[PDB]
Design an enzyme around this catalytic site. Structure first.
Site, PDB file in Angstrom:
ATOM      1  N   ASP B  25       0.819  -1.212   0.000  1.00  0.00           N
ATOM      2  CA  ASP B  25       0.000   0.000   0.000  1.00  0.00           C
ATOM      3  C   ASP B  25       0.853   1.263   0.000  1.00  0.00           C
ATOM      4  O   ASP B  25       1.322   1.711   1.050  1.00  0.00           O
ATOM      5  CB  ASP B  25      -0.943  -0.011   1.201  1.00  0.00           C
ATOM      6  CG  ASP B  25      -1.986   1.088   1.138  1.00  0.00           C
ATOM      7  OD1 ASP B  25      -1.917   1.929   0.222  1.00  0.00           O
ATOM      8  OD2 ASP B  25      -2.924   1.051   1.962  1.00  0.00           O
ATOM      9  N   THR B  26       1.089   1.814  -1.187  1.00  0.00           N
ATOM     10  CA  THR B  26       1.904   3.024  -1.327  1.00  0.00           C
ATOM     11  C   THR B  26       1.243   4.254  -0.695  1.00  0.00           C
ATOM     12  O   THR B  26       1.925   5.213  -0.342  1.00  0.00           O
ATOM     13  CB  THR B  26       2.204   3.327  -2.807  1.00  0.00           C
ATOM     14  OG1 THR B  26       0.973   3.494  -3.517  1.00  0.00           O
ATOM     15  CG2 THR B  26       3.002   2.197  -3.445  1.00  0.00           C
ATOM     16  N   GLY B  27      -0.057   4.169  -0.445  1.00  0.00           N
ATOM     17  CA  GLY B  27      -0.785   5.259   0.210  1.00  0.00           C
ATOM     18  C   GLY B  27      -0.647   5.257   1.722  1.00  0.00           C
ATOM     19  O   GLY B  27      -1.164   6.152   2.401  1.00  0.00           O
TER      20      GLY B  27
HETATM   21  C1  LIG Z   1      -3.291  10.526   5.735  1.00  0.00           C
HETATM   22  C2  LIG Z   1      -2.554  10.198   6.869  1.00  0.00           C
HETATM   23  C3  LIG Z   1      -1.857   8.993   6.945  1.00  0.00           C
HETATM   24  N1  LIG Z   1      -2.805   7.851   6.955  1.00  0.00           N
HETATM   25  C4  LIG Z   1      -2.416   6.628   6.403  1.00  0.00           C
HETATM   26  O1  LIG Z   1      -1.275   6.553   5.938  1.00  0.00           O
HETATM   27  C5  LIG Z   1      -3.332   5.558   6.348  1.00  0.00           C
HETATM   28  N2  LIG Z   1      -3.485   5.054   4.960  1.00  0.00           N
HETATM   29  C6  LIG Z   1      -4.731   4.757   4.388  1.00  0.00           C
HETATM   30  O2  LIG Z   1      -5.734   4.778   5.105  1.00  0.00           O
HETATM   31  C7  LIG Z   1      -4.814   4.644   2.986  1.00  0.00           C
HETATM   32  O3  LIG Z   1      -3.488   4.490   2.462  1.00  0.00           O
HETATM   33  C8  LIG Z   1      -5.661   3.438   2.545  1.00  0.00           C
HETATM   34  C9  LIG Z   1      -5.116   2.117   3.104  1.00  0.00           C
HETATM   35  C10 LIG Z   1      -5.621   0.933   2.261  1.00  0.00           C
HETATM   36  N3  LIG Z   1      -7.069   0.695   2.411  1.00  0.00           N
HETATM   37  C11 LIG Z   1      -7.283  -0.752   2.620  1.00  0.00           C
HETATM   38  C12 LIG Z   1      -8.612  -1.059   2.927  1.00  0.00           C
HETATM   39  C13 LIG Z   1      -9.299  -2.012   2.181  1.00  0.00           C
HETATM   40  C14 LIG Z   1     -10.592  -2.391   2.544  1.00  0.00           C
HETATM   41  C15 LIG Z   1     -11.205  -1.803   3.645  1.00  0.00           C
HETATM   42 BR1  LIG Z   1     -12.957  -2.331   4.177  1.00  0.00          BR
HETATM   43  C16 LIG Z   1     -10.498  -0.889   4.416  1.00  0.00           C
HETATM   44  C17 LIG Z   1      -9.187  -0.557   4.088  1.00  0.00           C
HETATM   45  N4  LIG Z   1      -7.652   1.043   1.374  1.00  0.00           N
HETATM   46  C18 LIG Z   1      -8.609   1.994   1.449  1.00  0.00           C
HETATM   47  O4  LIG Z   1      -8.917   2.574   2.494  1.00  0.00           O
HETATM   48  C19 LIG Z   1      -9.527   2.042   0.214  1.00  0.00           C
HETATM   49  N5  LIG Z   1     -10.603   1.049   0.329  1.00  0.00           N
HETATM   50  C20 LIG Z   1     -10.660  -0.013  -0.495  1.00  0.00           C
HETATM   51  O5  LIG Z   1      -9.920  -0.056  -1.488  1.00  0.00           O
HETATM   52  O6  LIG Z   1     -11.720  -0.872  -0.398  1.00  0.00           O
HETATM   53  C21 LIG Z   1     -11.387  -2.137  -0.980  1.00  0.00           C
HETATM   54  C22 LIG Z   1     -10.120   3.428  -0.053  1.00  0.00           C
HETATM   55  C23 LIG Z   1     -11.233   3.732   0.954  1.00  0.00           C
HETATM   56  C24 LIG Z   1      -9.032   4.497   0.056  1.00  0.00           C
HETATM   57  C25 LIG Z   1     -10.709   3.444  -1.465  1.00  0.00           C
HETATM   58  C26 LIG Z   1      -5.447   5.909   2.374  1.00  0.00           C
HETATM   59  C27 LIG Z   1      -4.999   7.062   3.013  1.00  0.00           C
HETATM   60  C28 LIG Z   1      -3.770   7.616   2.672  1.00  0.00           C
HETATM   61  C29 LIG Z   1      -3.324   8.765   3.317  1.00  0.00           C
HETATM   62  C30 LIG Z   1      -4.114   9.367   4.292  1.00  0.00           C
HETATM   63  C31 LIG Z   1      -5.352   8.824   4.613  1.00  0.00           C
HETATM   64  C32 LIG Z   1      -5.816   7.702   3.937  1.00  0.00           C
HETATM   65  C33 LIG Z   1      -2.898   4.427   7.296  1.00  0.00           C
HETATM   66  C34 LIG Z   1      -1.629   3.750   6.771  1.00  0.00           C
HETATM   67  C35 LIG Z   1      -2.610   5.025   8.673  1.00  0.00           C
HETATM   68  C36 LIG Z   1      -4.014   3.388   7.419  1.00  0.00           C
END
Ligand SMILES: C=CCNC(=O)[C@@H](NC(=O)[C@@](O)(CCCN(Cc1ccc(Br)cc1)NC(=O)[C@@H](NC(=O)OC)C(C)(C)C)Cc1ccccc1)C(C)(C)C
Ligand SMILES: [Cl-]
Ligand SMILES: [Cl-]
Ligand SMILES: [Cl-]
Lengths: 99, 99
Positions: B25-27
């Protein structure tokens, strides 16, 4: 380009003529942007993240440039912490992970 | 390897003597795994994503093997909907985004 991950992979996107910053997120199925205006009709979607579920507006067939690369696809709009470019558009611009 | 983004980029990890599947997860700033035991000190953390925040335990200096590549780093453990490998460990295995 080749983007390393020592910092957040933030890039400039262009959508509706406007530049924004967005995160390239291989963990995201979908692309979700902060509140903005887009044309046409939208459909409901509930998406799940690490904190739970949110409702977003789904717009289809939207032109969007990502790091200069042209894509046209589904953009979700809602209360996301940051603009996220998900796999639906990462595949359009030919992105892979490599190590 | 070159990992396509047509599908979710899931890999096998070895951690704490356990084999688990996780999403590259690059995000994600951090690596976050579903509830499990890990040895050593920890401290509480809140982490935020789509849908808001969850409380996790932060363990530092944890050995992990990702798709065959050894690394060491911080692993967060708590009620995440899915196992995520974040940038803190992706850097260590030399993972890059390419397009
Ligand atoms: C920002 C501050 C740092 N915050 C993180 O760095 C946080 N990072 C993230 O939350 C993200 O990188 C997303 C992590 C991966 N997630 C997995 C997932 C899969 C299923 C379910 Br049910 C729940 C989670 N995918 C999603 O949420 C995605 N859902 C999905 O595809 O449904 C299949 C969507 C909602 C973004 C579309 C995104 C992100 C990145 C940066 C900031 C905030 C959010 C941290 C590392 C602290 C969890
Ligand atoms: Cl799409
Ligand atoms: Cl770390
Ligand atoms: Cl490097």
């Amino acid at each position: 380009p080749q983007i390393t991950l020592w910092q957040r992979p933030l890039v400039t996107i262009k959508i509706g003529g406007q530049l924004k910053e967005a995160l390239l997120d291989t963990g995201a199925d979908d692309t979700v942007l902060e509140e903005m205006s887009l044309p046409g009709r939208w459909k409901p979607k509930m998406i799940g993240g690490i904190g739970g579920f949110i409702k977003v507006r789904q717009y289809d067939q939207i032109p969007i440039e990502i790091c200069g690369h042209k894509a046209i696809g589904t953009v979700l709009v809602g209360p996301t912490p940051t603009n996220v470019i998900g796999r639906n558009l990462l595949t359009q611009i030919g992105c892979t992970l490599n190590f």
